[PDB]
Amino acid sequence: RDNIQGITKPAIRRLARRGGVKRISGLIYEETRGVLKVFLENVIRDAVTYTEHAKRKTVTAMDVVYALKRQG
Template identity: 45%
Template sequence: MEAPLKLGKKKNYTSKYLPKRYRKNCRDNIMGITNTALLVAKPAIRRLARRGGVVRMQKAIYSTVREIIVSRLETILEQVVQLLESTDTPAKARKTVTTPDVSSSIALLG
């Protein structure tokens, strides 16, 4: 039976317990689309449009798309909150949003 590979400088620090060298960056995707100060907004909107089959867009479209996305997200989140508040009594109200909650609120919007 082989001994575990010792890579760290500390005693009993094997490769299994070494910290990760590169940590995954947690990005706020909604701010990337809706925030006009960030330069990430334009490519994100462009990727969404490419997925929908759009080839070319005017410059004025981006601000309009941002406003529409923000308003749509607000209505979806309002319906999700109403759904969570209406499930039980206020003492036992749920605080966790699940995938079926979001999909049912989107289905109600159409």
């Protein structure tokens, strides 16, 4: 439960400073947590069904790179 708080405020700040962002508003964090959740939902579904095709119970790295090649 509620493990989206692990993506913390200084980590978000470093991710913004890597892209060149100077100043951060206070409502940025709750939106970037949402877009990270949406992106992870869209990749982990394809990874789960790629694992389910092979009759396996472990998500391998090949399933992850296939799921990422699905999105591009």
